[PDB]
């Protein structure tokens, strides 16, 4: 009776229980039902003085309660912390009960259930049949979870079941609504417990005039008329709306394990449910494992932006990849095709050319290990392939090799040998295809829909959602379904509760929390010399450990409003509070009248936050080692999930220390952490800048003095290295923040830079730094143009790479998807960035010669475009969403669309996405001063031909373009002079 857990979910009826869904070795599904109680923590005297005795009480032993409230002090006579040591009791109430002096009230009931019962949310257990009572088929009841889960066993592999689905609706002019637009296609990917994978697609028949249905049936598709006569092994099935929706409702009702959809909670599921309701009163029903609760599907909202969730209670997890990707890691755009571009990419070699086609070959000897396999696996259902991140091509034939792939695309010939392949945008307009509906169009949309449905699966294995879910549930002590639904303040209560019980301590705030009230600027932007990147090894957790910065180890906070008291206090502080036992951290005063604020922390006994951080760091290091010494794929995935979970939970401490409604609120600790981090960053930045490498020695710009107090280490600036004698390099420091530091080396030989970076890292770690502060060499950047860490472009070489290596084109901050900028502006930005990157590698660039050259090029291009008028109108067309939900009085855009509606037979509704541009009489010459622009915007339709009496405002687009270009570049006076000469305005920098 060995079971592995999958999910834990609660019942929200009149009688509430808790559910365990588990699988055995064979593959059977077992549901176990527990009663859920309300957990309270009281003191022994409080327990002995309750008139109605609690339902059940369990001792916890002697706990020490500490008041962690902070009081200022304008002197050095500080009152000691008050601690109360007493026996403590834990009680369970079937119904909610209020206790006046209950403690530890910021922890969830489910976490108490787990920790008291000694059950991990996802372990493998040999259950006991004595305490389980059968009530239905597959649903049992348990009353004593403590003894039933006594035995623990090593994990064992189990199968799983998945559903992925996609929808394609009809639309002509606007975003579809349920009342006017039916479903054209639905696609399903299905994985059962037998391990067999099925794919199928349902096509509507109301757009398939009888002859087309007959020709499709003769072609090879299937036609059905009732619900009972559908078989899944048939790939394509033709049916009406009613039966299609009935099959959708039937499929959504099974007891799956994961129903995964990209943005399906807002559009797909809602669309199906509402359309089914309109067509027929029949509605989807979910039932509890005990067959006692029946609920209907109604998507609800949570404001975290708004994230939609399903009200299922049958144990299935309705997962939405969109929200997970949004809250997991940061991208430029969160479109499906953009994520596919960033995820599935490879490099291939051209084997054939000629006519309008090309043959690409891909193997592991070209890009890396596993990239070719992933690209080939996605290629099974792919339709369009993106090449060189510039062109989109239609696949004509594809052949999966034994350990690679080959593909033939319809692309123009290109003068190269190795190119980059990716999956991305599709050059198809669905509105036109829906206008002329024929069987070929229907089949091709069927292929698109099935590829879209499978892409969710491919992303699901790419991101490792299953292993990460299990790891997070185990570490956080939380049910699976809610691992990716809560913020940082909730995923920290489990480990914090465990640490509090292990240390036998309680922290209380017996007051109220009044609500008390940096951007780094790089020295230069265009670099043209190599940049070494270094990453700090978890600066905040390590420095919190170093300073013992915890709420319960704060000796006091001493403030002074005058130099008299400040000097006296500093003298008495150095007299009575000596190092290294204590530490004193200056901070910015919390009130305008204060001039000095000092917080004192004790290092005699380790705190609670440092203990949690040390535990997290040690576990992550152990899991890194275990992953590095592993060979199987499953073990590697599990270890990667564990290390990622520990990293993501250990990096949320600093934020929670500054949150009022958190369980780790500490103002003094937060300010101390920030100040000490700033001090360490400044010390490293000062010691690196100007340090040179002469002969076989390296000299730093300043003495290696500890910035906190006296240390027994040697402080000789000159350090002996083992690099070649002839090397003579001088380094500079440009940028530095919490998680990285940038260093500047004046050369272009990547191999020498890499070796010197490795040696410098070793020397800094062994000699310059101290205690548990260390750094790691990350990458080498070339052609660096940067405003901040939000926006920059460069070429990236990894640490373990040589001169003959493929660069990584890093570019972020720019969206390239903002559909209200231009079509001409984007192309100009791309060409000018390419020219900048081309001239930034020449060798003789300095600072004040790139700006003049780019300015002259911009002169030539802008004047040529203005005097030529050869650009088509479609490149200068902008678009905007129409909606009359506007405040104020007029907002002339409403006036413009109303006038167009009045003066043209074509009518624009309140959801139509309309095009507009700038047109003027052609007789006006170049204008420098600018006036209002809203009255020069005109709406362009399909039939609009630009008359000879009108032209387009080149000046507006040129001003926007030159503003964006001037946002780059170093010199200021030249740029402002150019801008004043051209458009007669002041540039808006930053």
């Amino acid at each position: 009776m060995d079971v592995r857990c999958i999910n834990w979910f609660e019942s929200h009826g009149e009688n509430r229980f808790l559910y365990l869904k588990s699988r055995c070795r064979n593959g059977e599904t077992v549901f176990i039902r527990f009663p859920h109680y309300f957990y309270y923590v009281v003191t022994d005297e409080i327990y002995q003085s309750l008139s109605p005795p609690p339902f059940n009480a369990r001792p916890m032993g002697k706990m020490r309660t500490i008041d962690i409230d902070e009081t200022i002090s304008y002197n050095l006579d500080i009152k000691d912390r008050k601690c109360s040591v007493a026996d403590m009791w834990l009680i369970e109430e079937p119904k909610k009960r209020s206790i006046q002096n209950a403690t530890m009230d910021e922890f969830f009931n489910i976490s108490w259930f787990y920790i008291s019962n000694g059950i991990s949310p996802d372990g493998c257990y040999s259950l006991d049949e004595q305490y389980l009572t059968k009530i239905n088929n597959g649903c049992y009841h348990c009353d004593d979870p403590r003894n039933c889960f006594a035995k623990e066993i090593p994990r064992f592999d189990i199968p799983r079941s998945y559903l992925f689905l996609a929808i394609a609706c009809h639309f002509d002019k606007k975003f579809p609504s349920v009342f006017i637009n039916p479903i054209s296609h639905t696609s399903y990917c299905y994985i059962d417990l037998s391990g067999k994978r099925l794919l199928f697609t349902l096509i509507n028949e109301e757009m398939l005039t009888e002859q087309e249905i007959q020709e499709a049936v003769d072609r090879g598709c299937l036609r059905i008329q009732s619900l009972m006569e559908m078989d899944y092994e048939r790939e394509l099935v033709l049916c009406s709306e009613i039966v299609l929706l009935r099959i959708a409702k039937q499929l959504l009702e099974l007891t799956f394990d994961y129903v995964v959809t990209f943005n399906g909670h807002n559009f797909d599921l809602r669309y199906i449910t509402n359309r089914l309701e309109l067509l027929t009163g029949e509605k989807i029903i979910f039932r509890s494992p005990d067959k006692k609760e029946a609920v209907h599907l109604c998507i609800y909202e949570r404001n975290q932006n708004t994230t939609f969730h399903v009200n299922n209670n049958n144990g299935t997890i309705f997962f939405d990849l969109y929200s997970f990707i949004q809250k997991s890691e940061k991208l430029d755009s969160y479109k499906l095709d953009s994520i596919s571009k960033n995820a599935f990419s490879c490099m291939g070699k051209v084997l054939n050319r000629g006519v309008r086609e090309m043959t690409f070959i891909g193997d592991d000897t070209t890009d890396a290990k596993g990239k070719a396999d992933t690209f080939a696996k996605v290629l099974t259902t792919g339709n369009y392939v993106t090449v060189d991140e510039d062109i989109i091509c239609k696949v004509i034939r594809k052949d999966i090799l034994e350990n690679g792939f080959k593909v033939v695309l319809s692309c123009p010939t290109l003068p190269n040998d190795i190119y980059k392949l990716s999956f991305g945008k599709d050059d198809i307009d669905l509105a036109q295809m829906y206008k002329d509906y024929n069987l070929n169009i229907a089949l091709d949309m069927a292929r698109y829909c099935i590829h879209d449905a499978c892409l969710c699966q491919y992303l699901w294995e790419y991101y490792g959602v299953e292993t990460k879910t299990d790891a997070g549930a185990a570490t956080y002590v939380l049910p699976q379904s809610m691992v990716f639904e809560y913020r940082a303040s909730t995923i920290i209560k489990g480990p914090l509760l465990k640490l509090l019980l292990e240390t036998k301590t309680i922290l209380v705030r017996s007051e109220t929390k009044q609500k008390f009230p940096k951007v780094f600027a790089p020295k230069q932007k265009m670099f043209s010399n190599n940049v070494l990147i270094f990453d700090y090894n978890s600066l905040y957790p390590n420095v919190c450990i170093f300073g013992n910065l915890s709420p319960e180890t704060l000796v006091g906070v001493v403030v002074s409003t005058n130099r008299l008291e400040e000097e006296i206090n500093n003298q008495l502080l150095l007299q009575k509070y000596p190092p290294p036992r204590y530490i004193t951290v200056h901070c910015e005063p919390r009130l305008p009248n204060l001039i000095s604020e000092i917080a004192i922390f004790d290092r005699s006994i380790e705190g609670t936050i440092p203990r949690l951080l040390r535990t997290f760091l040690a576990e992550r290091a152990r899991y890194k080692k275990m992953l590095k010494q592993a060979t199987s794929s499953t073990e590697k995935a599990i270890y990667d999930s564990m290390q990622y979970t520990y990293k993501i939970v250990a990096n949320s401490v600093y934020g929670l220390m500054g949150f009022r409604n958190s369980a780790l609120y500490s103002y003094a600790s937060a300010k101390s952490c920030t100040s000490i981090g700033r001090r360490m960053i400044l010390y490293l930045e000062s010691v690196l800048n100007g340090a040179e490498l002469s002969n076989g020695m390296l000299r730093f710009a300043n003495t290696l003095s500890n910035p906190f107090y006296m240390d027994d280490r040697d402080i000789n600036p000159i350090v002996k290295t083992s690099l070649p004698i002839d090397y003579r390099f001088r380094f500079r420091s440009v940028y530095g923040d919490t998680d990285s530091v940038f260093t500047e080396i004046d050369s272009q030989d990547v191999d020498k830079s890499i070796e010197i970076a490795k040696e410098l890292e070793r020397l800094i770690n062994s000699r310059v730094l101290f205690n548990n502060f260390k750094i790691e060499f990350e990458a080498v950047y070339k052609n660096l143009i940067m405003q901040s860490k939000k926006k920059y472009t460069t070429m990236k070489y990894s640490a373990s790479s040589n001169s003959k290596s493929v660069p990584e084109r890093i570019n972020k901050g720019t969206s390239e998807t903002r559909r209200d900028v231009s079509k001409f502006h984007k192309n100009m930005i791309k060409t000018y960035k390419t020219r900048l990157s081309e001239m930034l590698s020449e060798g003789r660039m300095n600072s004040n010669q790139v700006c003049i050259d780019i300015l002259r090029s911009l002169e030539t291009d802008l004047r040529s475009e203005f005097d030529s008028r050869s650009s088509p109108l479609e490149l200068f067309m902008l678009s905007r969403m129409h909606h009359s939900n506007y405040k104020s009085a007029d907002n002339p855009n409403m006036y413009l669309v109303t006038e167009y509606n009045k003066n043209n037979p074509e009518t624009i509704e309140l959801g139509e996405r309309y095009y507009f541009a700038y047109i003027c009489p052609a007789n006006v010459p170049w204008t420098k001063k600018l006036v209002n622009i809203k009255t020069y915007e005109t709406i362009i339709d399909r039939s609009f031909k630009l008359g000879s009496n009108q032209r387009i405002f080149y000046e507006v687009y040129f001003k926007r373009l030159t503003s964006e270009i001037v946002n780059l570049l170093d010199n200021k006076v030249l740029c402002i002079s150019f801008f004043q000469r051209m458009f007669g305005s002041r540039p808006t920098f930053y």
């Binding site: 304008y74 005058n562 008299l564 008291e565 003298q571």
Partner: protein, 416 residues
């Protein structure tokens, strides 16, 4: 919401808005916090010159009826309302007054909720009553209550008017003789029964006269008020140093002056001159002497003395040497808590009567040297702050502040 605590808090806000007073910092902070709470919980909320009508300056016929007449005196005016501290017009700062009168005023106010606030008149450490403001009870009944506690009460006259009467200057003189008060009469406020609007009468007249010089006279413990003398020797009362500086008085020059039937007062300069207050302050200081520094509303000494200051504030006997000083300090048992609950810097500041803001600003701009937890040497770091002559005077007196600070630290270590 279900409990009535929220609606009780809401009517508390409504009452506070009905009696809004921006001068009280604590009340304003509490009101702002409550407004923030209301606009955060409910996502939104809807949230004494006006008490006086136009002053009468010419004779006019009066409406027959029952009226109450009360002289308005010449001096600084204070207002004290329930739930807030005392308020002085213009800036709204605070001041320290004995707790006995605090309790008496609280007992007066809490008896009747209709009394909005009480009016205080201060002139050269002399506190008297002028008028009362209540929407339900006439002040006549509460003069008896105020006199019962021993607190001084003014002269009020209740007169019933039957026929039309002209408020000519002769009537004003007859009324003033009827009052027969030694204190100066700056105006007369008279009220009609049953009317919430209370109104005042002040006849005005102006001319030009020559002042010989401006002197200053001793009033008490480091409190001084400027005194102006003329050719004829008549004394002109001055409101404060602020009135002197804002009236733009000039030495050995003819100035325009306000007159009443019994006394004459200087008045504000309403011209469009370009004179700057900064140079006027130093000119007045030079005319009156460099041994003076302004504590806001008054002037103070710069005398060295040194040791004859702690005895006065401590309300103890005279001291000669250190050992007997320590013995006499120890022998007292009641004042000890003031020593044991208050710092040293502010204690020295009170002992030498230094201003709060001025000294606090000064001590943050010039460096010290501390040895054996004692002050030994000091030196100025930035000399710009010396531009104000008061800064220079305080810097000159700082040589005695350091010594008294050392002595206070010595005795503090000796006691504990």
């Amino acid at each position: 919401m279900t409990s009535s605590a929220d609606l009780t808090n809401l009517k508390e806000l409504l009452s506070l808005y009905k009696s809004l007073r921006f001068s009280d910092s604590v009340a304003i902070e509490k009101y702002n916090s409550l407004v923030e709470w209301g606009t955060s919980t409910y996502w939104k909320i809807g949230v004494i010159s006006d008490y006086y009508d136009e002053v009468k300056n010419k004779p006019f016929n009066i409406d027959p009826g029952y009226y109450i007449f009360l002289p308005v005196y010449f001096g600084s005016v204070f207002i004290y309302s329930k739930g807030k501290n005392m308020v002085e017009l213009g800036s709204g700062n605070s001041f320290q007054i004995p707790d006995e009168i605090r309790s008496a005023c609280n007992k007066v106010l809490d008896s009747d909720n209709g009394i909005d606030f009480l009016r205080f008149v201060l002139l050269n450490n002399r506190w008297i009553m002028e008028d009362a403001i209540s929407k339900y009870q006439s002040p006549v009944n509460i003069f008896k209550l105020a006199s019962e506690y021993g607190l001084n009460i003014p002269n009020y006259l209740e007169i019933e008017i039957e026929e039309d009467t002209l408020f000519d200057d002769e009537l004003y003189s007859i009324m003033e003789r009827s009052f027969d008060d030694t204190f100066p009469k700056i105006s007369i406020s008279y009220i009609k029964l049953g009317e919430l609007k209370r109104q005042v009468v002040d006849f005005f007249k102006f001319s030009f006269m020559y002042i010989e010089s401006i002197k200053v006279d001793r009033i008490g413990d480091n409190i001084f008020i400027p005194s102006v003398i003329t050719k004829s020797g008549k004394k002109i009362l001055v409101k404060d140093v602020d009135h002197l500086i804002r009236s733009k008085v000039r030495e050995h020059t003819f100035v325009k002056v306000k007159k009443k039937n019994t006394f004459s007062i200087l008045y504000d300069y309403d011209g469009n001159g370009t004179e700057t207050r900064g140079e006027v302050i130093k000119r007045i200081i030079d005319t009156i002497g460099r041994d003076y520094y302004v504590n806001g509303k008054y002037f103070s000494k710069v005398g060295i003395a040194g040791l004859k200051q702690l005895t006065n504030k401590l309300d103890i006997n005279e001291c000669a040497t250190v050992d007997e000083l320590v013995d006499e300090i120890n022998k007292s048992g009641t004042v000890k808590r003031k020593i044991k609950n208050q710092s040293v810097f502010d204690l020295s500041r009170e002992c030498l009567g230094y201003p709060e803001a001025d000294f606090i600003t000064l001590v943050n701009n010039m460096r010290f040297k501390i040895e054996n937890c004692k002050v030994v040497n000091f030196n100025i770091e930035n000399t710009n702050c010396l531009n104000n002559p008061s800064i220079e005077t305080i810097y000159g007196n700082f040589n005695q502040f350091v010594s008294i600070f050392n002595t206070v630290t010595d005795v503090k270590k000796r006691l504990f």
